[PDB]
C-alpha cells in the first residue's frame, strides 16, 4: 500500500496547484488590446471601490 510513497505525493500537491493556477492565469494573456484596456478599467473600478469602502 505504501510502495508509491503517499506522503511525497501529498507534499507534491502544491506543485500541481501552482501549475494549474499558472495555466489558468495565462488565459488572460490572450493578446487582445481591447481586453487589456478592459482589464485596466476593471482594475480601476476595483481600486476605486476598495478605496471607497475603507
Amino acid at each position: 500500500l505504501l510502495k508509491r510513497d503517499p506522503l511525497n505525493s501529498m507534499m507534491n500537491i502544491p506543485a500541481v496547484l501552482s501549475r494549474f493556477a499558472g495555466k489558468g492565469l495565462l488565459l488572460s494573456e490572450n493578446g487582445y488590446l481591447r481586453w487589456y484596456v478592459a482589464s485596466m478599467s476593471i482594475g480601476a473600478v476595483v481600486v476605486l471601490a476598495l478605496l471607497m469602502v475603507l
Binding site: 495565462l26 493578446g31 487582445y32 488590446l33 481591447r34 478592459a38 478599467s41
Partner: protein, 100 residues
Amino acid sequence: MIPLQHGLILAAILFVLGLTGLVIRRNLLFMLIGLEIMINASALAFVVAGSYWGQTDGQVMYILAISLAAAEASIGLALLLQLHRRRQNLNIDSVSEMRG
C-alpha cells in the same frame, strides 16, 4: 456661482464616455478618438480645479495636458497609418499575435 462639483462631474462624464468608446470599438481610429476624449476631459477637470481656487495653475496644467494630447494624437495617427499600410485594415483584434 458655478459649483466645482458640477464641473468635476461633467469632466468625469466625458472621461467615462471616452473610456467606453475606447473599449467597445474595434477600429483603431475610434480608439484614438476615445483617447483624445479622455485626455480632454482630464484637462477640463484641471481647468475647473484651477478656476475654483483662482489660480493660474489649472490653466498651466491645461497647457501641459494639451501638449501631451497633441503629441499622443500625432504618434497614434502615425501608428494607425503604419497599420493601414502594412495590413490594409484597421481591425485591432487582428493585431493579436503575441499571447501566452
